[PDB]
Symmetry: C3
Subunit: 314 residues, 3 copies
Amino acid sequence: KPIEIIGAPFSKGQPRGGVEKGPAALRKAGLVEKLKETEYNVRDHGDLAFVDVPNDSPFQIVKNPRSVGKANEQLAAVVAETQKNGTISVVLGGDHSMAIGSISGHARVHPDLCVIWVDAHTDINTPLTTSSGNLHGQPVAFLLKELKGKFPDVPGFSWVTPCISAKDIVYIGLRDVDPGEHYIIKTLGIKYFSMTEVDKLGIGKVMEETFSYLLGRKKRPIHLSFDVDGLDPVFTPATGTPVVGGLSYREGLYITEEIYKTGLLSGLDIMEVNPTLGKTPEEVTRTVNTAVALTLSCFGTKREGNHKPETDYL
Amino acid sequence: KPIEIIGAPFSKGQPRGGVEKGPAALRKAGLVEKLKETEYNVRDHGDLAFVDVPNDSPFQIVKNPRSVGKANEQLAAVVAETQKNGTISVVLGGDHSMAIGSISGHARVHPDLCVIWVDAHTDINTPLTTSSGNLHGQPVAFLLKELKGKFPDVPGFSWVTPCISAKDIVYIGLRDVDPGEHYIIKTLGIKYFSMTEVDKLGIGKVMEETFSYLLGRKKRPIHLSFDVDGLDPVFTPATGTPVVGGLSYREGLYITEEIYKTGLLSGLDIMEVNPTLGKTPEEVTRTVNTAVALTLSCFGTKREGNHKPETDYL
Amino acid sequence: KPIEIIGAPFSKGQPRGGVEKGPAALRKAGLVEKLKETEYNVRDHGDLAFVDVPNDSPFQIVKNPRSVGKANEQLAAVVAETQKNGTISVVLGGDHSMAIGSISGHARVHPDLCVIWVDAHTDINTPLTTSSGNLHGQPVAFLLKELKGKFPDVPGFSWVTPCISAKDIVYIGLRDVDPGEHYIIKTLGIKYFSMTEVDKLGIGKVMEETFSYLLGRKKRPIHLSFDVDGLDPVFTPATGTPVVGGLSYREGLYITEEIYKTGLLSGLDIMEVNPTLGKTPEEVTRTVNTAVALTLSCFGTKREGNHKPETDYL
Ligand SMILES: CC(C)[C@H](N)C(=O)O
Ligand SMILES: CC(C)[C@H](N)C(=O)O
Ligand SMILES: CC(C)[C@H](N)C(=O)O
Ligand SMILES: [Mn+2]
Ligand SMILES: [Mn+2]
Ligand SMILES: [Mn+2]
Ligand SMILES: [Mn+2]
Ligand SMILES: [Mn+2]
Ligand SMILES: [Mn+2]
């Protein structure tokens, strides 16, 4: 199988500068090289260049709507293209708003996919529910069919077509949810596993359950959208929205490994890694390193070890 | 439902100064305010003023017995008063010795209550088993019926009436038990979940089991007596008896949330937070903050999010 | 039962200086004294003195083969001697390469023993698979019967006799395995529980399973070879091969306690504690302290508490 890395150095989705540098940091950490060492064929598609929409006025509260919509429209395009060719897309990005694009494009080629969202937040605020004007917190809203029309059209997202329904997505790691967001997910009956459920069940049962839930009937393509703030700050401190009591490094890797074992990994998102937000270089090295780890995990690397087939090491 | 916060700035239960400042710290962290944001009606009853008993001689080994017994007798009174009115008591305190009062008063109004004790210790030493005259380590002994007479009467605790038996209390988080203490709990066949049980079962099964055990037959009122040292030092470092390998922040919240879900929370104790014992302001900010969190959890705040009823955020 | 502490201040098994100081550090932490406080009879056999083999040339890649083989031959001797007498051997050592000796000697007296290997690595590289001539990474290879002849004889290990087979050993905590090592363990069908299994099952089921696997049919003696890097660097930072996302302090203790409860603890190894590798004195105090704890755990100390029999504390 083939892998196509795609940088998405974007940051207008939120108010803290730095996330754009994410892809650079990950690459610098030897993501590509390491990935190549896997049983997969890899090709770096470089970092997309986002044209900045001059005079991007704040749609009501939402900020930089046109910049975000265009950047995403450009991504969904690049993504759909590679998916078409039958290669696994890996978007290294800035903020989580780019998920809109990454997923829209993926849906185009595999309209039946499901989405596994590991984040500490739901990012399902509609332009009508956000406190901030931050789009990195509304991604899911632009992708859910059930939310269609539930909020004004947005300057630049005209091109988006609610691809998945609330029955095809599953959260994991929720711990900081806005009232509006809770309302929604409860109303649309969206499956989820907040840290309280992870606590109760254990990452073991969690994955077991999300898999039956999303792949019980039909076996569809999987889209792993990983918000790095999904892990506890102690592992991925360099992020914009650190929230305590999150997923442990192990839990993070257990997830990525099980998804590997399904063999249904079609698309992947590694978002929110902000190099500039580390209090000590260590914090940044740490954040990045596990990001890479989660990635390699997705593509094979087991914690029990791996050996090349047909080779008698003895 | 109504909530009544009660400060118990007491510290004679143990040898390290600072715990009295506990309530102030918690309030300063905006405990009251936040609580108000909950679906509950809150009223701060202020910090009780404890009259210091001059020439409080050490009964054998036990220290400051009269100061402790009077402070508690004063509390049990204030507590019984609010419980009477049908409001939920929340004792913000200094050391865990004030549990005597908090519980005695609570029993008066609900003699059928059960007690969930999250602590790293048992605090069940009788004045005959303590190494240190510290009363903060003997609370349970003064409350257990089965221990009645098993130790000399104590200067000031005359007014106490062993309210609950060993069949109505359950420990959670034990990890530093004195030989005398182990003898007792094993002899009185008291239900408990030490870190080794939590490790074996998982906080999931733990809560499940303590609930069946204490609420299987009849549904009674719940009294949560939370010793802050129940969580690993890494979360609540600012305490007098830090003991490694304790309850994780998550585990702590899971507990408080399940108890919320029973709807049987009648009384609550937030003890041992000592602001002065933090090596770095962070350690104190950290300790306090999660204390508040455990509190808000008890009263609703879910990690999955919360939304106000009858409001269409859409 | 009797306990015999044996220091093995060795370090030629690997390239970082300091591990020889391990025993000193552990003793200085009051290991002996504390052990004495247990229901066990203890005797310190002091630290063996290892004669350095001059002009120890690198057998191909392997480094200091003769120094290592001799030091081990000297240990297996000292060990076999105490085992003979019917006392439990506790090897406090430098690097994990001394496991060769500790186990060989133990096998002599109890050829039916089983080995529980808690380490973050497998240390099963044959002199033909190692990237680094480091012997501390090949211990298991010199002990497995199934590996006999699968690699050239080594200058000084002539005296070793593959005592156990792949059906009598069980790993716990694996997370950094070399390709060669993975090949082997997969080829020899060796039972193991890498962190991913621990994640799936929980330390509870893990121990339960390893016990049924190794003690299902016959009840044999247990040899606990504990590599300190088995625990996450956040607990035992002072080691040469720190690897993230490892065994939690609790998990570590849970293991040692269960093995205590089988009553089949015959031999024990506390390896890799390197006092000189701590970034801050705290890291070293921390590493050592838990080492001691895992030890006392093996010999009784429960997290739920312990009380002396026949004594009425009341
Ligand atoms: C980013 C997220 C935590 C949040 N929903 C917001 O308002 O941006
Ligand atoms: C406080 C507690 C750990 C202990 N039982 C004592 O003697 O005070
Ligand atoms: C030490 C270990 C991690 C490794 N197998 C080596 O080559 O030394
Ligand atoms: Mn996000
Ligand atoms: Mn997030
Ligand atoms: Mn206590
Ligand atoms: Mn305590
Ligand atoms: Mn080792
Ligand atoms: Mn190791």
